[PDB]
Each structure stands twice: as C-alpha cells, then as structure tokens.
C-alpha cells in the first residue's frame, strides 16, 4: 500500500503575497484550530497505509490537511486568503465525503469547522 505525494507546499514559480488577511489566518485561525482537542486527526496528511484505508485515495482526489495548510502559511505559499480558506473547506468536505455521518472523525471535523467559520467572520478587511 502507498500514500500519494503530499500536496504542494513549495513552488518558486508561484507568485507570493503577504497580506493582513493571510497573517490573520496563520496567527489567529490556524493557531486556534491547531490547539483544539480534536485537531490531531487533521494535523498531517491522512496516512492511509498506517490506517489501513486502502480505498481512501480512490475516493479522495484532492487531499488536504492542517499540516499542509500550516506549511503553506508559514512559508508563504499563497497569493490570497481565499486560497487558504478553500484548503480548509476541502479538508472538511473530504472528511464528510469519505466517512459516515456521525462517525467520530465527522463530529471532530464539524467542531473544527464551526470554530473555523466563527473565526472567518472576523477576517479583517484588506489593508
Ligand atoms: C478516521 C481516519 C482519519 C484521520 C485520523 O484518524 N488520523 C489521520 C490520525 C492518525 C491515525 C493513525 C495514524 C496517524 C499517523 N499519521 O501516523 C494519524 N483523519 C482523517 C481526516 C481521517 C479520515 C479517514 O477522514
Ligand atoms: Na459519506
């Protein structure tokens, strides 16, 4: 069994921009979600080999996780906040697509998503 390569986190050809919204996503949104008691299943790419989920990457073709998001934020991978917000949304949706409603992993995802959306409501205006 094999995992795919992880999502891209370095590309010197991709133009980059530091923005107050992106700083907010790292400083406030990611940091807050990362420390949450249910963050641990989302802090790295799903290891389908270790977890014995050989169909995972048959079902999930755009994998995403907070470890990848943290790296993208910390090493300034993004141009805008919407790119990052999309990554969070993809992580949550993948979980809801792959797992059954009311699986523990889904309850965890929903808790994080609720917190995520609350923080996104305070996304600062672009300076
Ligand atoms: C339920 C499996 C799962 C987890 C999960 O439980 N994880 C990823 C922690 C873990 C366990 C076992 C091993 C490891 C390691 N990385 O070594 C990590 N997270 C997600 C998004 C899912 C699914 C299928 O949606
Ligand atoms: Na499902």
UniProtKB/Swiss-Prot annotation:
Marked site (Acetylated histone binding) residue numbers: 99
Compartment(s): Nucleus; Chromosome
Covalent link Glycyl lysine isopeptide (Lys-Gly) (interchain with G-Cter in SUMO2), residues: 58
Subunit organization: Interacts with p53/TP53; the interaction is direct. Interacts (via CTD region) with CDK9 and CCNT1, acting as an associated component of P-TEFb complex. Interacts with RELA (when acetylated at 'Lys-310'). Interacts (via NET domain) with NSD3, CHD4, BICRA and ATAD5. The interaction with BICRA bridges BRD4 to the GBAF complex. Interacts (via NET domain) with JMJD6 (via JmjC and N-terminal domains); the interaction is stronger in presence of ssRNA and recruits JMJD6 on distal enhancers. Interacts with NSD3. Interacts with NIPBL.
Similarity comment: family membership: Belongs to the BET family.
Miscellaneous comment: JQ1, a thieno-triazolo-1,4-diazepine derivative, and I-BET, a benzodiazepine derivative, have been tested on tumors with success. Treatment with GSK1210151A (I-BET151, a I-BET derivative) has strong effets on mixed lineage leukemia and promotes myeloid differentiation and leukemia stem-cell depletion.
Disease: Cornelia de Lange syndrome 6: A form of Cornelia de Lange syndrome, a clinically heterogeneous developmental disorder associated with malformations affecting multiple systems. It is characterized by facial dysmorphisms, abnormal hands and feet, growth delay, cognitive retardation, hirsutism, gastroesophageal dysfunction and cardiac, ophthalmologic and genitourinary anomalies. CDLS6 inheritance is autosomal dominant. A chromosomal aberration involving BRD4 is found in a rare, aggressive, and lethal carcinoma arising in midline organs of young people. Translocation t(15;19)(q14;p13) with NUTM1 which produces a BRD4-NUTM1 fusion protein.
Comment field on protein domains: The NET domain mediates interaction with a number of chromatin proteins involved in transcription regulation (NSD3, JMJD6, CHD4, GLTSCR1 and ATAD5).
Function: Chromatin reader protein that recognizes and binds acetylated histones and plays a key role in transmission of epigenetic memory across cell divisions and transcription regulation. Remains associated with acetylated chromatin throughout the entire cell cycle and provides epigenetic memory for postmitotic G1 gene transcription by preserving acetylated chromatin status and maintaining high-order chromatin structure. During interphase, plays a key role in regulating the transcription of signal-inducible genes by associating with the P-TEFb complex and recruiting it to promoters.
Protein name: Bromodomain-containing protein 4
Lineage, uppermost ranks: Eukaryota, Metazoa, Chordata, Craniata, Vertebrata
Parent-record interval covered: 42 to 168 of 1362
């Amino acid at each position: 069994s094999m995992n795919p390569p992880p999502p891209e986190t370095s590309n010197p050809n991709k133009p980059k921009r530091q923005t107050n919204q992106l700083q907010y996503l790292l400083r406030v949104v990611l940091k807050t979600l990362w420390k949450h008691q249910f963050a641990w299943p989302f802090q790295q790419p799903v290891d389908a080999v270790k977890l014995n989920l050989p169909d995972y990457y048959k079902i999930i073709k755009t994998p995403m996780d907070m470890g990848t998001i943290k790296k993208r934020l910390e090493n300034n991978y993004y141009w805008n906040a919407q790119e990052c917000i999309q990554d969070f949304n993809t992580m949550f949706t993948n979980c809801y697509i792959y797992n059954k409603p009311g699986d523990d992993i889904v309850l965890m995802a929903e808790a994080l998503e609720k917190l995520f959306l609350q923080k996104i409501n305070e996304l600062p205006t672009e300076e």
